Design a protein around this nucleic acid. Sequence first.
RNA 1: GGAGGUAUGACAA
RNA 2: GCCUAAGGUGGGAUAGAUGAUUGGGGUGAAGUCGUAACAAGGUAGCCGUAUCGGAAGGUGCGGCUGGAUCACCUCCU
RNA 3: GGGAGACUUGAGUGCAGAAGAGGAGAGUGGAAUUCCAUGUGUAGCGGUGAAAUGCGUAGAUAUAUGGAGGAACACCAGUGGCGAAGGCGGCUCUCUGGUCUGUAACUGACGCUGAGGCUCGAAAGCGUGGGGAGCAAACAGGAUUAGAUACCCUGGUAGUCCACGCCGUAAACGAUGAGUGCUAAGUGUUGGAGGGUUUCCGCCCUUCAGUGCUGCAGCAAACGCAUUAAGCACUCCGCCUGGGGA
RNA 4: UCUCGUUAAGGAACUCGGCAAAAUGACCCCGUAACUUCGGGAGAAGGGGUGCUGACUUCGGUCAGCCGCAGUGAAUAGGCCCAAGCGACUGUUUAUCAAAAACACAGGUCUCUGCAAAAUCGUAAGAUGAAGUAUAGGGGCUGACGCCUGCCCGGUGCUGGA
RNA 5: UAGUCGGGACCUAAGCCGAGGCCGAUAGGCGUAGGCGAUGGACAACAGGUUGAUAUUCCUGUACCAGUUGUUUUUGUUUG
RNA 6: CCCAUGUCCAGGUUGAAGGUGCGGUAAAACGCACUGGAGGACCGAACCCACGUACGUUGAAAAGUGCGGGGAUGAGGUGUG
Lengths: 274, 85
Amino acid sequence: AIKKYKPTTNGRRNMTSSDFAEITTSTPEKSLLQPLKNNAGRNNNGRITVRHQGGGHKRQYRVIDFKRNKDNVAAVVKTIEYDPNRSANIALVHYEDGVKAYILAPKGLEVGMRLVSGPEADIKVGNALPLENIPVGTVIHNIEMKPGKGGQLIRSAGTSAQVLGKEGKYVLIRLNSGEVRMILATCRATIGSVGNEQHELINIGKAGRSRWMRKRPTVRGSVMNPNDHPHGGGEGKTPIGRKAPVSPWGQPAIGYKTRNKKAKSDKLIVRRRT
Amino acid sequence: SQERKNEIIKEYARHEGDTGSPEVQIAVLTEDINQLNEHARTHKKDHHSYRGLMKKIGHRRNLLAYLRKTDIQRYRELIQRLGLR
RNA sequence: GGAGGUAUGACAA
RNA sequence: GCCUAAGGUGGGAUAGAUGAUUGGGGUGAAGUCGUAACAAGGUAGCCGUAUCGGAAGGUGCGGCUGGAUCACCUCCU
RNA sequence: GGGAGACUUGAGUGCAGAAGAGGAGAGUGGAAUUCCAUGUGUAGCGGUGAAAUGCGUAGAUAUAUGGAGGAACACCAGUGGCGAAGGCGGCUCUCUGGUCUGUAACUGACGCUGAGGCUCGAAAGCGUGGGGAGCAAACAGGAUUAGAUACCCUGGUAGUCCACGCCGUAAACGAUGAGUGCUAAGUGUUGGAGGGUUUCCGCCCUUCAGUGCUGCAGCAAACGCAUUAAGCACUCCGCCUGGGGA
RNA sequence: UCUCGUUAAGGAACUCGGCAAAAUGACCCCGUAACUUCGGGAGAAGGGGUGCUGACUUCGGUCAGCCGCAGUGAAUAGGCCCAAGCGACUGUUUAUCAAAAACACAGGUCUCUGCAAAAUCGUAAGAUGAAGUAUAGGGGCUGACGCCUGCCCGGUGCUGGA
RNA sequence: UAGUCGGGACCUAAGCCGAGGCCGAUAGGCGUAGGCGAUGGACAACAGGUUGAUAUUCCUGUACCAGUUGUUUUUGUUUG
RNA sequence: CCCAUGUCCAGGUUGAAGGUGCGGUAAAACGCACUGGAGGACCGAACCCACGUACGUUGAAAAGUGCGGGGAUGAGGUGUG
Ligand SMILES: [K+]
Ligand SMILES: [K+]
Ligand SMILES: [K+]
Ligand SMILES: [K+]
Ligand SMILES: [K+]
Ligand SMILES: [K+]
Ligand SMILES: [K+]
Ligand SMILES: [K+]
Ligand SMILES: [K+]
Ligand SMILES: [K+]
Ligand SMILES: [K+]
Ligand SMILES: [K+]
Ligand SMILES: [K+]
Ligand SMILES: [K+]
Ligand SMILES: [K+]
Ligand SMILES: [K+]
Ligand SMILES: [K+]
Ligand SMILES: [K+]
Ligand SMILES: [K+]
Ligand SMILES: [K+]
Ligand SMILES: [K+]
Ligand SMILES: [K+]
Ligand SMILES: [K+]
Ligand SMILES: [K+]
Ligand SMILES: [K+]
Ligand SMILES: [K+]
Ligand SMILES: [K+]
Ligand SMILES: [Mg+2]
Ligand SMILES: [Mg+2]
Ligand SMILES: [Mg+2]
Ligand SMILES: [Mg+2]
Ligand SMILES: [Mg+2]
Ligand SMILES: [Mg+2]
Ligand SMILES: [Mg+2]
Ligand SMILES: [Mg+2]
Ligand SMILES: [Mg+2]
Ligand SMILES: [Mg+2]
Ligand SMILES: [Mg+2]
Ligand SMILES: [Mg+2]
Ligand SMILES: [Mg+2]
Ligand SMILES: [Mg+2]
Ligand SMILES: [Mg+2]
Ligand SMILES: [Mg+2]
Ligand SMILES: [Mg+2]
Ligand SMILES: [Mg+2]
Ligand SMILES: [Mg+2]
Ligand SMILES: [Mg+2]
Ligand SMILES: [Mg+2]
Ligand SMILES: [Mg+2]
Ligand SMILES: [Mg+2]
Ligand SMILES: [Mg+2]
Ligand SMILES: [Mg+2]
Ligand SMILES: [Mg+2]
Ligand SMILES: [Mg+2]
Ligand SMILES: [Mg+2]
Ligand SMILES: [Mg+2]
Ligand SMILES: [Mg+2]
Ligand SMILES: [Mg+2]
Ligand SMILES: [Mg+2]
Ligand SMILES: [Mg+2]
Ligand SMILES: [Mg+2]
């Protein structure tokens, strides 16, 4: 649930946060933790390549089993855990043979559920099957784009996709964005939608909290100088004062499409959206 | 349920064959009221059934008032067994 | 026969 | 020395007066604009609500007959 | 009126039955509209009092085959049913309220009304998140007209739909508060019950509770009401006291 | 001239401006308005008490007495109030003449992006974005919250058509 | 003046270097294995005394850590 | 500006959510206490900052000092690499 803080301070005023009710532990699985340094938007040349990233809290990476290709044994859900690296929660599962893994927690997943993966798995939340084995109309997430590569699509909190049909070696899927496309039928997906649906409703509340979450401030181009931004300069506040608004590198910011016009996947995208 | 109703009737019957009496009626109304409350919390938009719950509550209250005005010893005995207030 | 339903124009005289 | 009237200071409470300006309302034998209602009032009217328009009002949604006319079945004399 | 008893008719429980678009949740069906794709096909289509805007040779409308999506549920359907009212109409299941009829085993006046409080409450509207076929305030264009910020036409956004939370108002009307008893008849119909016939089917009669129509007594300013009273009575509540200003 | 102390009567008449200085200052107690997002506004304001010595104590006082001009006796610890503009707020900035009404901000909205994502660094390889995946990431504008955000698509851009 | 302090003969972070490798007019750029790299991890002694100037470093007392040689004691010799 | 790894913030104050008890109720909402210890929270040293003013202006100083001033658990200060 979302808890609304009382306005004890102006910073606390209008702020909200999740009450983390679904989280059953705060002791992550040591075996599955890996270190990640904060790149702060800087690449192997040490240059800022993505603005507005850096600082904030330290994090340990939780190795998520996106492939879900262990089909022999079932895995019992042990915990629902907070994952600082993604908007969704993750579930610690113990395979009967003693192998431990993390998965994305689907909506409605509960501690104690027994999950299976493979062509013969039931159509149940948390089970992962090849798309060819999933009946049409089923809500799915964690869709892999290439066989054996692991889930890549529909992984953020509250997201879901739906199977629309089978044509050839491809399954017609509606993605979370509304786009309808073909995914290779040998690709696997997990049944259900991603949990933590309330994630989008959080009112961050104060600037410091965004800094905790590794976001550095955005400066508007209009309040820069002309040598910094096409919107820079002018006396006083100014309008855009150009044909169209542009990025710092002169690329139109309202409406101009940036997808490669010769994309290979265009053959596989049936109906676009976003 | 007629089975659950009869077994409550036998547990609280003032004597053999006593179906009607403040104790029997109140107790049966008490399990009826509890079950309908569970339904109410699951179906919070079922306003029409909730009105049935309220009439059950008022009838139970009226019978409790009659029992208290009539035999305060019985009234205290009953409310303890059913856990009322 | 009966019944519920499907543009403008004083004032008094 | 205690109590204490009056007096002084302070922040509130309460009642009337007055105030640039402002709001709708009532009045005013014969002003301007339209014609909304009363007949089916010429788009039936009215109710609540929303929205728009100089203005009466218009339009949408639901409701009412306190509905003119011709056309049906049930009912009943 | 108070106190101690007794009672069973009011009220309730039990037992046995009856009907129902009563409510909530989750699914699901066909018809139709729209859009989309593909054939066929060729210059119109659409619309009005008459027109035009609009759509169409960038191939329409029509027609065929499919696909998507939303909303509403033809026939049944009925002064028919259910609900306190607002209201409830495809079908299926799950949860759930109430009512009615017999019986007379049980309780033994436990009842009625109910200021204040609480709950529910059409439509429009509001907030957050979805959806969006059709319809359609606003709005645009075309007309009509003296003018038209209308009626008419072509479009069309909110809204209409869903979830959750607000709002709390309607010619929210039977413009008739609730409870109880009493006071001619006739005739429909919905759900019951009992009996007399009928080979059954059904018909006959008695009856309970609804729902209508007609109509005495009585009532009413009149209109009209009339066992579903606006009649004859008792209890409690709400409300009224010339019109306007409100 | 600088730095510091005291000043009769007056008390902002000074001055662009109460600049500077003065005054307030601790603790306890009484008490505390408009307005409000119901948290606040408040330490609002405005007042009272404070030393010493006995007696007595429920251990905080109370009673009584005593001295001084003065008792947080020195030092160090808010001046306050009314009202208007602007910015919601804490923050940030012109190192060295500008700390602000500027930037940022949470919130809003638009748009791009189906993942070898868009975007960016690079001739490239290789990276960042992300060991992220549309509730995510980039970009433009607006800038808490409340109520709201009307008309114009001819022009220019963008998008689609072809 | 130190087996015991701090550093090395221990460890890894960021980062850096980088066999082959990938890329590129030249130069070189990037990068795998492998390493380097503390500001972190690990790690055995203390009190007093002493000099003009050093001391947990010298000295006194009493310790600890790793290892070496020998003596005695136990037990194991390839079902160990 | 960022990365990895350390480290610093005297002392007071306020009293958010949650919890408990007792009232309240059909159950609730909810009221009152207590507990609880939130915050780019409050007062205030160190620490960081640099708002006013005087002075300095061949300076004590190529930007400071005096008296006051703001922040001071954070979008914080600061060390090492
Ligand atoms: K805030
Ligand atoms: K998370
Ligand atoms: K900005
Ligand atoms: K500018
Ligand atoms: K009219
Ligand atoms: K009605
Ligand atoms: K039933
Ligand atoms: K709405
Ligand atoms: K009848
Ligand atoms: K003077
Ligand atoms: K104040
Ligand atoms: K004194
Ligand atoms: K002070
Ligand atoms: K500012
Ligand atoms: K701001
Ligand atoms: K503002
Ligand atoms: K400042
Ligand atoms: K700035
Ligand atoms: K706003
Ligand atoms: K943005
Ligand atoms: K703009
Ligand atoms: K923003
Ligand atoms: K334009
Ligand atoms: K244009
Ligand atoms: K050493
Ligand atoms: K070290
Ligand atoms: K200074
Ligand atoms: Mg950004
Ligand atoms: Mg500038
Ligand atoms: Mg330029
Ligand atoms: Mg410019
Ligand atoms: Mg200007
Ligand atoms: Mg007229
Ligand atoms: Mg009319
Ligand atoms: Mg009329
Ligand atoms: Mg209009
Ligand atoms: Mg509505
Ligand atoms: Mg009313
Ligand atoms: Mg009848
Ligand atoms: Mg003087
Ligand atoms: Mg003097
Ligand atoms: Mg002056
Ligand atoms: Mg002067
Ligand atoms: Mg001053
Ligand atoms: Mg002093
Ligand atoms: Mg500011
Ligand atoms: Mg500030
Ligand atoms: Mg400067
Ligand atoms: Mg300055
Ligand atoms: Mg701005
Ligand atoms: Mg060492
Ligand atoms: Mg290298
Ligand atoms: Mg080489
Ligand atoms: Mg390595
Ligand atoms: Mg050591
Ligand atoms: Mg020395
Ligand atoms: Mg603070
Ligand atoms: Mg401070
Ligand atoms: Mg320092
Ligand atoms: Mg600075
Ligand atoms: Mg402050």
